């Protein structure tokens, strides 16, 4: 399909494991907002877009009930064929050119995720980092797998080398993708 | 490693030349497999796999469902374009342009939006092409892109290299210089 722009106004995701669901809108491949199904709240990962319209979170809850219902039907019609675990692909790169003493952001891209269940954490000098970490939702792909991106704001220096740690059922053991200045 | 079963319902809006041309497609997906599709260019549900046949058959028989799907293009795609997408399409973030030697020169063009970008390398006002390699566009996930365009070179004293960048957020091209030191 040839178009100038593409929106997903309803990426609706629901899986048996949990069970668990996700509702997001995407425009030209970036996330506009998600719905926190727990809190019943529309949330914008980049609050700038909250100026571009509102969304009633109830619409997502409604689609999630349909999803639950349709998934059970489809499990039967597909002879209970379970999801094949894919091997995720991990890349770590920085947001801008890296200068020591100049605050930057590391970016961990976890691509080819299926099913959408993953643990992504950061390690500085082999130790788990907590602060300065954030994360996208599971973003959709035209082959119906997902990617997820995690961020680490960091001050580059000689003292710190970092890893991105990724856990997924398609991996035998945790995958560590290393990055250093 | 737990079993899992995944359901995805995607509502997609494709836009060309403003809203002169609008196409909507919905996809019902079991695990990675699209089983039934509505495509506004087609006008009815279409089974994509055998498991989608009774689904498409039923919905095509129900005028309420069929008319709901057919109305989607105006009630969802065009509606959302006026409420949100027209606004999002006005977003412009200028690229940062940075030259760094890796003999290879790396021109980093970072933090720009939208994705349309032109980058050229010059040596002494003569354009280089034979020794140039670029990455694909890189999605940061935070509504910015970056791209790297490398130049194979052999620096003589006196040579001037320039990275030349055009982008819709720029009235005139950014040029950055690198001199053999």
């Amino acid at each position: 399909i040839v178009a100038d722009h593409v929106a997903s106004c309803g990426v609706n995701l629901y899986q048996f494991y949990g069970p668990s669901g996700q509702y997001t809108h995407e425009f030209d491949g970036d996330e506009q907002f998600y719905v926190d199904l727990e809190r019943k709240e529309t949330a914008w990962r980049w609050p700038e877009f909250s100026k571009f319209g509102g969304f009633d979170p109830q619409g997502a809850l409604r689609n999630m009930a349909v999803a639950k219902h349709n998934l059970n039907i489809m499990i039967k019609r597909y002879n209970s064929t379970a999801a094949t675990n894919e091997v995720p692909e991990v890349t770590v790169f920085s947001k801008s050119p890296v200068t020591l003493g100049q605050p930057n952001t590391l970016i961990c891209l976890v691509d080819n995720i299926f099913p959408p269940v993953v643990n992504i954490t950061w390690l500085s000098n082999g130790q788990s980092v907590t602060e300065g970490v954030s994360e996208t939702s599971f973003l959709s792909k035209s082959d119906h797998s997902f990617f997820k991106i995690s961020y680490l704001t960091f001050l580059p220096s000689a003292d710190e080398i970092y890893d991105c740690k990724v856990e997924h059922w398609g991996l035998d053991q945790p995958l560590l993708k290393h990055w250093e200045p | 490693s737990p079993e899992d079963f995944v359901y995805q319902f995607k509502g997609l809006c494709y836009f060309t030349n403003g809203t002169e041309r609008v196409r909507g497609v919905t996809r019902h997906i079991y695990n990675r497999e699209e089983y039934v599709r509505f495509d506004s260019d087609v006008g009815v549900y279409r089974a994509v796999t055998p498991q989608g046949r009774p689904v498409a058959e039923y919905w095509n028989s129900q005028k309420e469902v069929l008319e709901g799907a057919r109305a989607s293009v105006d009630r969802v795609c065009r509606h959302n374009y006026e409420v949100a997408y027209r606004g999002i399409l006005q977003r412009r973030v200028e690229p940062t342009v940075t030259i760094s030697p890796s003999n290879l020169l790396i021109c980093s063009v970072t933090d720009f939006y939208p994705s349309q970008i032109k980058v050229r390398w010059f040596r002494n006002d003569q354009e280089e092409t034979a020794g140039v390699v670029s990455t694909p566009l890189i999605r940061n996930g935070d509504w910015t892109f970056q791209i790297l365009v490398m130049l194979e070179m052999t620096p003589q004293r006196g040579d001037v290299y320039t990275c030349h960048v055009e982008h819709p957020s720029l009235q005139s091209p950014i040029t950055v210089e690198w001199r053999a030191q």
Partner: T-cell receptor, first 114, second 111 residues
Framework: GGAGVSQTPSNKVTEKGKYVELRCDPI?????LYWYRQSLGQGPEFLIY????????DSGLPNDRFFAVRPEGSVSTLKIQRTERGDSAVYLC??????????FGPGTRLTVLE | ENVEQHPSTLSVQEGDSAVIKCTYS??????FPWYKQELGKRPQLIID?????GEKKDQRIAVTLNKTAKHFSLHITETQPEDSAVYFC???????????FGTGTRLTIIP
């Protein structure tokens, strides 16, 4: 289901502390099913909304003695545990082809006595 | 989010018009059905109107909608005795399909 929304019986009388089940039979093929509650001289108030077998919205359930099911995306049953006098009202079932346009059944009046 | 309905009771001579007015609180409301309820029975859907339309008529009954004022009304012309019932207005929105009802109007047609 049938051509209209059915609820039987029209009336149920019971005493405090007993268990009660109210049954709704939807219009054939209707994906959406709602329970509303109507007290004397008032309008219907929302209790719970099913899409197929799934609960879309249960925000109206008064407390945890109230629970409903729709195990096969057709017939729904509203269950009330340990009934109190304040639960007395007319319980109305409504179903919708897709969700928006709602057709009501004739209701079941629950009378909980001392 | 509530719907406000007036009057709570109304008597009108057979053959005269009957008018019921409602106001709603949520500007996102886009669907507005009206129900007629006979004693011992179910609210019966008699007419509805959507936010893209200001008026709709069906036989003896009419509904009007003013999105700006968030007012909507039901008119019953040349009332007949079988119009005696309790009438409810209601409202819902694109994202929230649950109906919220007014408090009702007991209409008595004097034969």
């Amino acid at each position: 289901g049938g051509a209209g929304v059915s609820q039987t019986p029209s009336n149920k009388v019971t005493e405090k502390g007993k268990y009660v089940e109210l049954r709704c039979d939807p219009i054939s093929g209707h994906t959406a099913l709602y329970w509303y509650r109507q007290s004397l001289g008032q309008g219907p108030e929302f209790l719970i909304y099913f899409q197929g077998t799934g609960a879309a919205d249960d925000s109206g359930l008064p407390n945890d003695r109230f629970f409903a099911v729709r195990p096969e995306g057709s017939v729904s049953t509203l269950k009330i545990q340990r009934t109190e006098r304040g639960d007395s009202a007319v319980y109305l079932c409504a179903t919708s082809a897709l969700g928006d346009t709602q057709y009501f059944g004739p209701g079941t009046r629950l009378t909980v006595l001392e | 989010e509530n719907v406000e309905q007036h009057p709570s009771t109304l008597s009108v001579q057979e053959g005269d018009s009957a008018v019921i007015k409602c106001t709603y609180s949520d500007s996102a409301s886009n669907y507005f059905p009206w129900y007629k309820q006979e004693l011992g029975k179910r609210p019966q859907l008699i007419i509805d109107i959507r936010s893209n339309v200001g008026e709709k008529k069906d036989q003896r009954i009419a509904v009007t909608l003013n999105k700006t004022a968030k007012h909507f009304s039901l008119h019953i012309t040349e009332t007949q005795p079988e119009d005696s019932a309790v009438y409810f207005c209601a409202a819902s929105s694109f994202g929230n399909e649950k109906l919220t009802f007014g408090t009702g109007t007991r209409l008595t047609i004097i034969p």
